[PDB]
Design an enzyme around this catalytic site. Structure first.
Site, PDB file in Angstrom:
ATOM      1  N   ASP A  60       0.885  -1.173   0.114  1.00  0.00           N
ATOM      2  CA  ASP A  60       0.013   0.098  -0.141  1.00  0.00           C
ATOM      3  C   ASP A  60       0.996   1.204   0.123  1.00  0.00           C
ATOM      4  OD1 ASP A  60      -2.778   1.021   1.750  1.00  0.00           O
ATOM      5  OD2 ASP A  60      -1.391   2.627   0.963  1.00  0.00           O
ATOM      6  N   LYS A  73      15.562   2.554   0.991  1.00  0.00           N
ATOM      7  CA  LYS A  73      15.790   3.168  -0.409  1.00  0.00           C
ATOM      8  C   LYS A  73      15.164   2.083  -1.423  1.00  0.00           C
ATOM      9  CE  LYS A  73      19.432   6.336  -0.886  1.00  0.00           C
ATOM     10  NZ  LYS A  73      19.933   7.512  -1.548  1.00  0.00           N
ATOM     11  N   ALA A 123      -5.353   4.549   3.016  1.00  0.00           N
ATOM     12  CA  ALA A 123      -7.009   4.691   3.221  1.00  0.00           C
ATOM     13  C   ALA A 123      -7.386   4.531   4.718  1.00  0.00           C
ATOM     14  CB  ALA A 123      -7.626   3.441   2.378  1.00  0.00           C
ATOM     15  N   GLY A 124      -6.566   4.015   5.502  1.00  0.00           N
ATOM     16  CA  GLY A 124      -6.788   3.981   6.961  1.00  0.00           C
ATOM     17  C   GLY A 124      -5.711   4.431   8.080  1.00  0.00           C
ATOM     18  N   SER A 259      16.254   0.754  -5.134  1.00  0.00           N
ATOM     19  CA  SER A 259      16.417   2.136  -5.747  1.00  0.00           C
ATOM     20  C   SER A 259      17.380   1.713  -7.071  1.00  0.00           C
ATOM     21  CB  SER A 259      17.190   3.361  -5.000  1.00  0.00           C
ATOM     22  OG  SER A 259      16.436   4.441  -5.046  1.00  0.00           O
ATOM     23  N   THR A 459      23.109  28.476 -25.053  1.00  0.00           N
ATOM     24  CA  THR A 459      22.936  28.438 -23.544  1.00  0.00           C
ATOM     25  C   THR A 459      22.808  27.303 -22.840  1.00  0.00           C
ATOM     26  OG1 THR A 459      20.568  29.350 -23.454  1.00  0.00           O
ATOM     27  CG2 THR A 459      22.022  30.761 -24.545  1.00  0.00           C
ATOM     28  N   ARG A 463      15.936  25.243 -24.218  1.00  0.00           N
ATOM     29  CA  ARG A 463      15.437  27.058 -23.909  1.00  0.00           C
ATOM     30  C   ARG A 463      15.033  27.820 -25.141  1.00  0.00           C
ATOM     31  NH1 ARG A 463      18.518  29.482 -18.500  1.00  0.00           N
ATOM     32  NH2 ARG A 463      20.398  30.382 -19.386  1.00  0.00           N
ATOM     33  N   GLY A 466      18.973  30.226 -27.021  1.00  0.00           N
ATOM     34  CA  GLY A 466      20.057  29.137 -27.131  1.00  0.00           C
ATOM     35  C   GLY A 466      19.734  27.862 -27.559  1.00  0.00           C
TER      36      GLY A 466
END
Ligand code: FE
Ligand code: FE
Length: 689
Positions: A60, A73, A123-124, A259, A459, A463, A466
């Site tokens: 959960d 982790k 939920a609880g 991980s 740059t 973006r 650039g």
């Protein structure tokens, strides 16, 4: 391979034995022969993944927020899927399914008994005790929550709490002796099929379980009767009104592979294979989500369709949501400590440079604005998400990699201007910058016409001036996507490092961090990537008119941005022509809007009202700006704000990511990004579900 077998973690014998009703039928059918592991408490398995002896596990979320702090982790790999077919719901709900006759309402869950599935489960507990939290009148500066959620309920049964320190809080519990009120289905009252059951008999009163758990234990419709629920607005509805009696939307249960190193795609591969073969409604003398009569939801919650695949940048804190990251946090956060972080903002300061200027204002405000310091800005718009940073000032492209991510425009760094000099700077609207491609007059064999194969300068990577306008202009004539090819060897601070794109950067001074979307990358920024052509690193350095202007003719500091003569540089125009740095008026690839700040539309409205303050103390008209401190000034490097910008204009309306950028220009990012897929755009449009 010591990795061609998934060690699943079993917490029972019948979940461990479903796991063997499952280990047989699998590698026979052909796939990584499943190892099934013996265990117990909810973490004796969230830990056994973290220690490398048990390789997978289904949880959960209130618990997946837990299996993902820093002690263990573990990232969830597969979201569990809900509902029925024409409608499979990948998230879920959390109601309070009470018996037709008990007359209390939610504002009256004070003193009566209770029935939680569990301790830690959404939920609880992550969901419903902050829904009630107000009369808990629990003190943190003395007592704990599971402590003053005992003073409230005269009798309840939340599993996993200590049977020793929380008796009242392990009283309506039917488990076997030492197994009484314990962290497992060994407590007959532990779960939506332990907490539902907690009331169907009368022992435990409110049952805080999802929306469809009544359904599973109570087949008969002339049985879903005796249960008028409890809604948010202090009322009651049938088990089919789960919808308006919700308390909130939470992602469902997930699966937790470490991980890094838990063999994330073997774990899923068993599931290419489970959802189909033994999927719901297919092959059955063994379903994938089901335990025999008398045991509930072993391995995977009974009746659930299955699993989903979660896009690796979305882990623990990230999957539970932000609307729900307001549940799990709230409580362990005092009541006076929850406003400490609501009349507060956090400036996602990208780097050790954009970060130090922050920390001079982390306290130049008197500590009202603190930092969220990542080293990309694709890492940082993500941090705006995780209840970790209010906002930050992104420049177009980034408002589109943070425009599919949910971020909607607040204030705009309207710099200083002359036309419409008339108004007030805030109340003066966006008269933007004109993207450009400057070169040296030394470069006589270059006009846009002649740009392929020469070097480049950009740059940051996505973006405006650039990139977007350049690589999104070098694609409209061209035809071919691959941006790296048009140019010989370039410096692109943000993309593939070992390419012809970062094939021309410098990084810091030691040589390190070659090519990086964080300023230490010497040739990064409007002024960093203006050095790019300003130190003959390249034939061109896509800029903002104002960068050729404010780093030459005696204006920087800088030993590079000084001896330069701006009138040494021509502005590559659009018809194979050439004009001085001067005539950037008829010439500019395209006009564009300044950089606005981005925070989630629940964090919007406050970052407006703090910055509509600090752009006015340490603002250019700031009482405390040239003297005490100027929030816009930064020695021709520009840390956080346009060294240029005057104020932080009011944008007005509520202009989505799209309607902020210009529309024409918006149809430019989308069609460009059809060529390179950012992972922050991968698991950002996965967060809506
Ligand atoms: Fe749950
Ligand atoms: Fe920009």
């Amino acid at each position: 391979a010591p990795r061609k077998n998934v060690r699943w973690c079993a917490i029972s014998l019948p979940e461990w034995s479903k796991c063997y009703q499952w280990q047989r039928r699998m590698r026979k059918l052909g796939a990584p022969s499943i190892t099934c592991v013996r265990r117990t408490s909810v973490l004796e398995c969230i830990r056994a993944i973290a220690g490398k002896n048990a390789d997978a596990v289904t949880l959960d979320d209130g618990m997946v927020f837990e299996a993902g702090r820093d002690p263990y982790k573990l990232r969830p790999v597969a979201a569990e899927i809900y509902g029925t077919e024409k409608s499979p719901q990948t998230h879920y709900y959390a109601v309070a399914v009470v018996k037709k006759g008990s007359n209390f309402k939610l504002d009256q869950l004070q003193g009566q008994k209770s029935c939680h599935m569990g301790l830690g489960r959404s939920a609880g507990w992550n969901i419903p005790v902050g829904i009630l939290r107000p009369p808990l009148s629990w003190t943190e500066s003395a007592e704990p929550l599971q402590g003053a959620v005992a003073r409230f309920f005269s009798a309840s049964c939340v599993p996993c709490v200590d049977g020793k320190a929380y008796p009242n809080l392990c009283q309506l519990c039917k488990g076997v002796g030492e197994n009484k009120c314990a962290c497992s289905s060994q407590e007959p009252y532990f779960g939506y099929s332990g907490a539902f059951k907690c009331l169907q008999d009368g022992a435990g009163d409110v049952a805080f379980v999802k929306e469809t758990t009544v359904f599973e234990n109570l087949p008969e419709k002339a049985d879903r009767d005796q249960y008028e629920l409890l809604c948010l607005n202090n009322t009651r509805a049938p088990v089919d009104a789960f919808k308006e009696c919700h308390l909130a939307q939470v992602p469902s249960h997930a699966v937790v592979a470490r991980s890094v190193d838990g063999k994330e795609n073997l774990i899923w591969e068993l599931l290419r294979k489970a959802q189909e073969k033994f999927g719901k409604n297919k092959s059955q003398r063994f379903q994938l989500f089901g335990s025999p009569e008398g045991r509930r939801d072993l391995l995977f919650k009974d009746s659930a369709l299955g699993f989903l695949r979660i896009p690796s940048k979305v882990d623990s804190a990230l999957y539970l949501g932000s609307r729900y990251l307001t549940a799990l946090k709230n409580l362990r956060e005092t009541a006076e400590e929850v406003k400490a972080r609501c009349t507060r903002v956090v400036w996602c300061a990208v780097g050790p440079e954009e970060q130090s200027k922050c920390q001079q204002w982390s306290e130049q405000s008197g500590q009202n604005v603190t930092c969220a310091t990542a080293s990309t800005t694709d890492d940082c718009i993500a941090l705006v998400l995780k209840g970790e940073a209010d906002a930050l000032s992104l420049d177009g492209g980034y408002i589109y990699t943070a425009g599919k991510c949910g971020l909607v425009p607040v204030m705009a760094e309207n710099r200083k201007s002359s036309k419409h000099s008339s108004l007030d700077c805030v109340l003066r609207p966006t008269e933007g910058y004109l993207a450009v491609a400057v070169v040296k007059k030394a470069n006589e064999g270059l006009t846009w016409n002649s740009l392929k194969g020469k070097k480049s300068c950009h740059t940051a990577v996505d973006r405006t001036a650039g990139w977007n306008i350049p690589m999104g202009l070098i694609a409209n004539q061209t035809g071919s996507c691959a941006f790296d090819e048009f140019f010989s060897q370039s410096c692109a601070p943000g993309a593939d490092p070992k390419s012809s794109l970062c094939a021309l950067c410098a990084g810091d001074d030691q040589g390190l961090d070659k090519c990086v979307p964080n300023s230490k990358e010497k040739y990064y920024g409007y002024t960093g990537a203006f050095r790019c052509l300003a130190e003959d690193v390249g034939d061109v350095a896509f800029v903002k008119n104002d960068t050729v202007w404010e780093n030459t003719n005696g204006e920087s500091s800088a030993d590079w941005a000084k001896n330069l003569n701006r009138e040494d540089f021509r502005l590559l125009c659009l018809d194979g022509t050439t004009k001085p740095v001067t005539e950037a008026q008829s010439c500019y690839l395209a006009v564009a809007p300044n950089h606005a700040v981005v925070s989630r539309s629940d964090r919007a409205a406050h970052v407006e009202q703090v910055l509509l303050h600090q752009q006015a103390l340490f603002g250019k008209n700031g009482k405390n700006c040239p003297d005490k401190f100027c929030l816009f000034k930064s020695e021709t490097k520009n840390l956080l704000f346009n060294d240029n910008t005057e104020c932080l204009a009011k944008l007005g309306g509520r202009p989505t990511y799209e309607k902020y950028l210009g529309t024409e220009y918006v149809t430019a990012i989308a069609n460009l990004k059809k060529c390179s897929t950012s992972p922050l755009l991968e698991a950002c449009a996965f967060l809506t579900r």
